From TrEMBL, chain C:
Name listed for the protein in its UniProt record: Orexin receptor type 2
Keywords, comma-separated and alphabetical: Cell membrane, Disulfide bond, G-protein coupled receptor, Glycoprotein, Membrane, Receptor, Transducer, Transmembrane, Transmembrane helix
Any Gene Ontology biological process: regulation of cytosolic calcium ion concentration
Lineage: Eukaryota, Metazoa, Chordata, Craniata, Vertebrata
Organism this protein belongs to: Homo sapiens (Human)
Membrane topology, as annotated: Multi-pass membrane protein
Range within the parent protein: 50 to 380 of 444
Sequence ranges assigned to domain G-protein coupled receptors family 1 profile in this UniProt record: 22-267
GO molecular function: orexin receptor activity
Subcellular location: Cell membrane
GO CC, any one term: plasma membrane
Keyword Transmembrane helix recorded: yes
Membrane-crossing residue ranges in chain numbering: 6-31, 43-63, 83-101, 122-141, 165-187, 206-225, 245-270
Main location: membrane
Length: 226, 339, 283, 59, 234
């Protein structure tokens, strides 16, 4: 090798060192995918394509909020297939678009390139749902025939213990998503249902805990501990 | 209502053009090539492996000097490889890490890339400052870019996800021409060797030939079952083959306005990610989703060989202008040169 | 002694066959398959290589010495072969300890990402270096003596304190610290896991992880305890019935040998993912 | 509908230009493709193996 | 925008010391290797030392090895040269040269202004064909150089360089690897040759081509220069 070749190899070594350092720094973080319908408060879940960065317990995250592209999402979803988890937000107050949300969730859950990614659900606007069902003007049974015969699983999630009709309504809506998730998947990925208020700020901790379980499950599968 | 009349007229037009295509179909390519000696078994071996990427590689483009490369990955780095010595000539950081395309200018002075940011960035490689700078940020697309090509280093053809293509003026950055007519997301571009005609495939199973000088769609080909992923012209420039998501490649002819050959197998049920041609056009290469690339014969529609060695999805292919090397990117951050 | 000659020989040959077959299958599977080369398998390959070395070197010589109190090899072989024997044992034990630590990092602290290929390589080379540097006493304080008829390798020391201190160091580096590390890591994993189908499979994984520590402790306790008692406490100095002590040494060696045979099985061969990956790689 | 009108005009113009042009027969087009393949089959390295003395990627 | 300014001149007695500093601006200094080139008033250009990118490999000339110290400061974009064991031989003109090495780079495209250092009182040798030949503008003048060893490497690249020095100005790069014209040089110069024989060809001379031409090899260290051909207007 000549002097030019030796200097070029030295330059290539320096370039490779810089690339390795940058890749290490990039690998030290977690990336998620943000999805949901309109008026779902995706941008306020955590307080071309919008990106958000937050840090929890010396662990920083990146949420890739996509709003620039139109409803066509089947073709560019391949990019977000190595992410840690997917945050799926549903406006559970409005019962007209729940079927669309269920259909949208089912497609993402059964997506070919998304077969190994855990999905985190955020049923938003809990306060709006609570007041809407307390008013009694709009009844869930009008849209869902299964709501009448469904019964409360006699487990109380809220501490104050409000009207059990609200609790029965919340569990049924959560039960729909849970059943859709558990219909298929082979157990490679699991759902993490949640109930988030519009003014709720205790969301990063829930994301942080869910990501911890997902990475723990990923390590168990890869370390042959199964 | 004029809607019924227009739909009936369109149906009549489709029927008569189908009949016209049937009129010229006095033979079949597979029957014409039955008398030709087959290509036989081809055994190509990996010569170099270009390590250094730490994320999924989405695109690659051979240089016009047949030695330099450009590769793009979700890591956010654009790397130029001295293919003979595997040295990294340049490492270009990207503002947006979601890039799905890259292009190397014929003059070698410029390199382009783009993706889920709706901007086609231009980098000036040969400058007296010694580093790589940003020349032009081309904005105006309302969808994610799918493929970029350089047209005589002064015109840029871009196809985005908003069902349209465009022609750009690099010096000013304004679109000199916009190509419309696709209903699905456009996924690929290819410039003919005359640098005067080009075709694009979209998520509509339709391939359309466009006259870049006039900006009005000249030809349209249909017959695939699902989304189109990659298109490349034959070296003679009068024909082109396309790769779709329905596990088959079809060879189209511009003059005949017909399908000429179907490249598929009973054991192949995976999508197709990239298609390329040899120097002579005798060999057809396709990068499938079974982590391997098959080597089809453009005249016999058989598998002359298989390229394997990637432990993830094959993403990009390419044959150098000299025809002496083939680089096959994949999702395991590894570029392998086969010859 | 006891009427155990043929059954002991059959057990030794069975251990040889099973250990060799398991190690070669694991090594070939990892070397041939491309989707299995990972950090968690680098340590497995190191363990398999160490176990191959153990079964190739110390099995035949140790069996021959236990059967007949005669050393059939020259001075150079007496100086070198024990070195290889004990360094292979030590590197195997250190590999087990480092695997336990790696699993503890992967379980209890998943967010702080570690266990990279560079870190695994550094741990492997440090383990090899420390084993080789500690085993130089065994390399240099090995001599063969002729007894009037008899020829057995024995250690000659310039004093009654140097062998005792060296052998207590040997005990604390081969059993005490590795055992403490493994038990601490596995206790932490068991706590974090155990303390509804997911929980059931997680408890199954926890119990299968605990039984590995149990079998390691059971199969390496006797040799260490007997070596300590014989060396630093001066036990079995003037023995009339050498048959009993030689049978005890043979049993402890066989326990070590069975553990070396079982490790390539118990860590990965019975796991479903590894088993199906092996089947795909071969079939 | 303007989009229907535009589609109809595009179809009629495109298809009239395609029909009233020298549509090469499929046999002649295949002959041209075969001739090009045969002509460049002596210059394409991937089809005709080349000795390593000329191959620049030799190890 | 590319600027190179030196400092550390004056009068020094033999056996003393001095610190030279070449300040770089207008370009990515960290990505460019740097050289020091010495020119005696009556002898010509001579190589001194070389510093790689990011303080990598360091090379020194045989005649000055062990007596000089070359330092690099990437954050300050400045070169540092330490002068020790001064003698009368070191009285010359010192330049700092920009350099970069990749597949198609120009490794001697830029030269500094230079600084004056006066002191009070194997290798590859290239011989210049001539030292002075009169010229008339409008015609072609060919300059030839020879080398003691063939400069054609196994990779096909030959490492002959041509430098033109204006009277009273720093030298510039005309052709690198005997065939590629440097950026900004008008397409009137050409080069050719094989083995050890090389020629530099100028199509038509102008008033700006008066100077001294040097042939340089970059095959293996240390770097050497030719005696120099001077063209005189006539
Ligand atoms: C009492 O056993 C020995 O300390 N040995 C050491 C010297 C070689 C001796 N064998 S020999 C004389 O060359 O035939 C003998 C056999 O060592 C092998 C390898 C090491 C194993 C071990 C020892 C202590 C603690 C944990 C494991 C035992 C088996
Ligand atoms: C007791 C002797 C040393 C125990 C082994 C050292 C602890 C782990 C080392 C591996 C590592 O740090 O990479
Ligand atoms: C018992 C004495 C040795 C204890 C463990 C030393 C292992 C060193 C590796 C770091 C892990 C300790 C930790 O940070 O929790």
């Amino acid at each position: 090798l000549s002097a030019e070749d030796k200097a070029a190899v030295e330059r290539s070594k320096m370039i490779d060192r810089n690339l390795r350092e940058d890749g290490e720094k990039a690998r030290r973080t977690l990336r998620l995918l943000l999805l949901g319908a309109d008026n779902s408060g995706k941008s306020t879940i955590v307080k071309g394509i919008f990106e958000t960065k937050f840090q929890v317990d010396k662990v920083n995250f990146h949420m890739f909020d996509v709003g620039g592209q139109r409803d066509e999402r089947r073709k560019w979803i391949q990019c977000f297939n190595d992410v840690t988890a997917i945050i799926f937000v549903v406006d559970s107050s409005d019962y007209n678009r729940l079927q669309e949300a269920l259909n949208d969730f089912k497609s993402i859950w059964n997506n070919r390139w998304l077969r190994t990614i855990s999905v985190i659900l955020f049923l938003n606007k809990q306060d709006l749902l609570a007041e809407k069902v307390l008013a009694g003007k709009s009844k869930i049974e009008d849209y869902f025939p299964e709501f009448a015969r469904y019964t409360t699983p006699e487990d109380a999630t809220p501490e104050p213990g409000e009207d059990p009709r609200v609790t029965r309504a919340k569990y049924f809506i959560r039960k729909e998503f849970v059943d859709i998730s558990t219909a298929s998947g082979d157990g490679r990925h699991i759902c993490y249902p949640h109930f988030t208020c519009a003014v709720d700020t205790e969301n990063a901790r829930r994301i942080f805990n869910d990501c911890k379980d997902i990475i723990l499950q990923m390590n168990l599968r890869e370390y042959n501990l199964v | 209502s004029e809607l019924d009349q227009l739909r009936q007229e369109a149906e009549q037009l489709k029927n008569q053009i189908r009949d016209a295509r049937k009129a010229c179909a006095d033979a079949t390519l597979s029957q014409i090539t039955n008398n030709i000696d087959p290509v036989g078994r081809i055994q190509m071996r990996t010569r170099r492996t270009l390590r250094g990427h730490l994320a999924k590689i989405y695109a690659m483009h051979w240089g016009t000097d047949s030695r330099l490369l450009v590769s793009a990955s979700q890591d956010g780095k654009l790397i130029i490889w001295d293919s003979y010595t595997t040295n990294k000539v340049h490492a270009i950081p990207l503002r947006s890490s979601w890039v799905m395309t890259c292009a190397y200018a014929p003059s070698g002075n410029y390199v382009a890339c783009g993706g889920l940011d709706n901007i086609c960035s231009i980098y000036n490689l040969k400058t007296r400052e010694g580093n790589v700078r940003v020349s032009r940020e081309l904005a105006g697309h309302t969808g994610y870019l799918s493929c970029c090509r350089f047209l005589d280093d002064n015109q840029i053809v871009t196809s985005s996800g908003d069902t349209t293509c465009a022609l750009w003026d690099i010096e000013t950055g304004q679109q000199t021409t916009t190509f419309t007519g696709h209903t699905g997301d456009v996924m690929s571009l290819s410039l003919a060797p005359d640098t005067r005609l080009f075709v694009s495939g979209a998520c509509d199973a339709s391939a359309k030939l466009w006259d870049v000088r006039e900006g009005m769609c000249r030809q349209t080909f249909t017959g695939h079952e699902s989304d189109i992923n990659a298109i490349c012209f034959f070296p003679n420039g009068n024909a082109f083959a396309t790769g779709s998501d329905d596990a088959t490649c079809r060879l189209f002819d511009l003059r005949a306005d017909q399908e000429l050959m179907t490249y598929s197998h009973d054991n192949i049920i995976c999508g197709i990610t990239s298609v390329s041609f040899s120097k002579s056009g005798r060999l057809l290469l396709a990068g499938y989703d079974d982590f391997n690339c098959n080597v089809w014969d453009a005249l016999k529609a058989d598998r002359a060989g298989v390229l394997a060695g990637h432990d993830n999805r094959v993403s990009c292919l390419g044959v150098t202008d000299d025809g002496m090397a083939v680089a096959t990117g994949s999702w395991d951050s590894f570029l392998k040169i086969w010859n | 002694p006891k009427e155990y000659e043929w059954v002991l020989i059959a057990g030794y040959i069975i251990v040889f066959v099973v250990a060799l077959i398991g190690n070669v299958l694991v090594c070939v599977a990892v070397w041939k398959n491309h989707h299995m080369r990972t950090v968690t398998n680098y340590f497995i390959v190191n363990l398999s290589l160490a176990d191959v070395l153990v079964t190739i070197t110390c099995l035949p010589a140790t069996l021959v010495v236990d059967i007949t109190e005669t050393w059939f090899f020259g001075q150079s072989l007496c100086k070198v072969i024990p070195y290889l024997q004990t360094v292979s044992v030590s590197v195997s034990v250190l590999t087990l300890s480092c695997i336990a630590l790696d699993r503890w990092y992967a379980i209890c602290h998943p967010l702080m990402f570690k266990s990279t290929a560079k870190r695994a390589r550094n741990s492997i080379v440090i383990i090899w270096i420390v084993s080789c540097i500690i085993m130089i006493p065994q390399a240099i304080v090995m001599e063969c003596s002729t007894v009037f008829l008899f020829t057995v390798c024995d250690e000659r020391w310039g004093g009654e304190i140097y062998p005792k201190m060296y052998h207590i160091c040997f005990f604390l580096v081969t059993y005490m610290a590795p055992l403490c590390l493994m038990v601490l890591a596995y206790l932490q994993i068991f706590r974090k896991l155990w303390c509804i189908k997911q929980i059931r499979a997680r408890r199954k994984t926890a119990r299968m992880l605990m039984v590995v520590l149990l079998v390691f402790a059971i199969c390496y306790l006797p040799i260490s305890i007997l070596n300590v008692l014989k060396r630093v406490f001066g036990m079995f100095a003037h023995t009339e019935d050498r048959e009993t002590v030689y049978a005890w040494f043979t049993f402890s060696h066989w326990l070590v040998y069975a553990n070396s045979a079982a490790n390539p099985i118990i860590y990965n061969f019975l796991s479903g993912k590894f088993r199906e990956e092996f089947k795909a790689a071969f079939s | 509908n303007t989009a229907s009108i535009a589609q109809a005009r595009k179809l009629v113009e495109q298809l009239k230009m395609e029909a009233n042009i020298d549509r090469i027969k499929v046999s002649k087009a295949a002959a041209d493709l075969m001739a090009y393949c045969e002509a460049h089959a002596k210059e394409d390295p991937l089809l005709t193996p080349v000795p390593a003395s000329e191959n620049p990627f030799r190890e | 925008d590319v600027q190179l300014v030196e400092s550390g001149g004056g009068l020094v007695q033999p056996g003393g010391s001095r610190k030279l500093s070449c300040s770089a601006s207008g370009f990515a200094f960290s990505s460019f290797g740097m050289h020091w080139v010495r020119q005696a008033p009556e002898k010509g250009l001579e190589w001194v030392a070389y510093i790689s990118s990011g303080s990598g490999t360091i090379y020194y000339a045989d005649t000055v090895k062990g007596r000089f110290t070359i330092s690099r400061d990437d954050p300050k974009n400045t070169l540092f040269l330490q002068m020790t064991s001064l003698r009368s031989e070191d009285t010359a003109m010192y330049y700092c040269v920009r350099s970069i090495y990749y597949y198609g780079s120009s490794p001697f495209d830029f030269w500094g202004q230079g600084t004056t250092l006066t002191v009070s009182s194997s290798d590859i040798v290239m011989t210049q064909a001539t030292s002075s030949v009169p010229v008339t503008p409008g015609e072609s003048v060919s300059i030839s150089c020879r080398s003691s060893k063939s400069l054609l490497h196994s990779n096909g690249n030959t490492y002959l360089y041509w430098f033109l020095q204006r009277p009273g100005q720093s030298p510039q790069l005309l052709i690198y690897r005997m065939s590629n014209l440097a950026s900004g040089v008008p397409d009137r110069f050409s080069g050719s040759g094989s083995g050890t024989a090389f020629t530099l060809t100028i199509s038509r001379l102008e008033a700006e081509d008066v100077g001294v031409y040097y042939c340089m090899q970059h095959l293996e260290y240390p770097l050497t220069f030719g005696a120099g051909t001077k063209l005189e207007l006539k």
